């Protein structure tokens, strides 16, 4: 009911700074909690750097639920939001 169909999404297709920071923090915490990594690890040891590398390659398995003021929400995958 409150969900919005994928073909009717009107929000911006770009990743906001707040969304980027929240995803980076969540991914860093999850990696620090022994989560599987979807990208190769060459020399980096900081979980934040691993999360940033995953974000650059668009491999973070998270979904942003943007809330409209009325109450409805739009679900955007992290693999479909444009990252600057």
């Amino acid at each position: 009911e409150l969900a919005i169909l994928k073909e009717e999404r009107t929000t911006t297709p770009y990743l906001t700074k707040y969304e980027r920071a929240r995803i980076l923090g969540t991914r860093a915490l999850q990696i620090s909690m022994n989560a599987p990594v979807l990208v190769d690890i060459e020399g980096e040891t900081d979980p934040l750097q691993i999360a940033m590398k995953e974000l650059s390659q668009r491999k973070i398995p998270l979904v942003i639920r943007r809330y409209l003021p009325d109450g409805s929400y739009e679900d955007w995958g992290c693999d479909e939001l444009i990252v600057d």
Binding site: L68, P69, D70, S72
Partner: protein, 212 residues
């Protein structure tokens, strides 16, 4: 002083005609561009005494306003002869409005109106009566540079705005009923007006205000 009074009366009459035209009622082109000399010739007598009863007139909505707004009826504009407004004169005007099946009527006084006259103004259903001061009608406020253009939205347009913004009626910006622009447009409760405004960041801006 007589010439000043006549000129002020003519300006007020022109403002009332412009207000009636803006509401969607049909006003003839020759009446809109009526000159001061013609007004004094057809209204003022030999002694220069104005004839307030002769200025009262009737107007009907244009077909464009008829299709745009379905709640428009006949309009009657009456000028009070005496300066004060007693309860008896208001009762007579209300009886005339009821007997002449006028949807709306504009009453204009000179000095003031009694509170007892304003006591019984909600008792004219289904008709609507509005009270105006002649001294307040000398200058058209809508021609001011600081006052942007207001356009009353239709029911369909208001609904479309509501689903476009996913809004409730109370979540829109509000405009008071006593706002002189709202009184000029004859706004009623629950009606939304669109305002086109100049903006130094984007050129044009559109706002919406719902009447209280």
């Amino acid at each position: 002083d007589n010439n000043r009074i006549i000129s002020r009366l003519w300006r007020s009459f022109r403002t009332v005609k412009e207000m009636a035209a803006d509401r969607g009622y049909f006003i003839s082109q020759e009446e809109m561009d009526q000159s001061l000399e013609e007004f004094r010739s057809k209204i003022c007598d030999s002694m220069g005494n104005p004839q307030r009863k002769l200025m009262s007139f009737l107007a009907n909505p244009t077909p464009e306003a008829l299709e745009k707004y379905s709640d428009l009826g006949t309009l009657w504009v009456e000028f009070c002869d005496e300066p004060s407004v007693g309860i008896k004169t208001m009762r007579n005007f209300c009886l005339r409005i009821q007997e002449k099946n006028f949807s709306t009527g504009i009453f204009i006084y000179q000095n003031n109106i009694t509170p007892s006259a304003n006591k019984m103004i909600p008792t004219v259903s289904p008709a609507i009566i509005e009270t105006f001061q002649e001294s307040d009608l000398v200058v058209n406020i809508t021609h001011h540079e600081l006052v942007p253009k207001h356009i009353r939205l239709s029911d369909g347009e208001k609904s479309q705005l509501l689903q476009r913004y996913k809004l409730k009626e109370s979540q829109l910006p509000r405009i008071q009923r006593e706002d002189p622009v709202a009184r000029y447009l004859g706004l009623k409760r629950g009606q939304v007006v669109k305002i086109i405004r100049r903006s130094e960041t984007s050129g044009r801006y559109a706002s919406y205000r719902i009447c209280l």
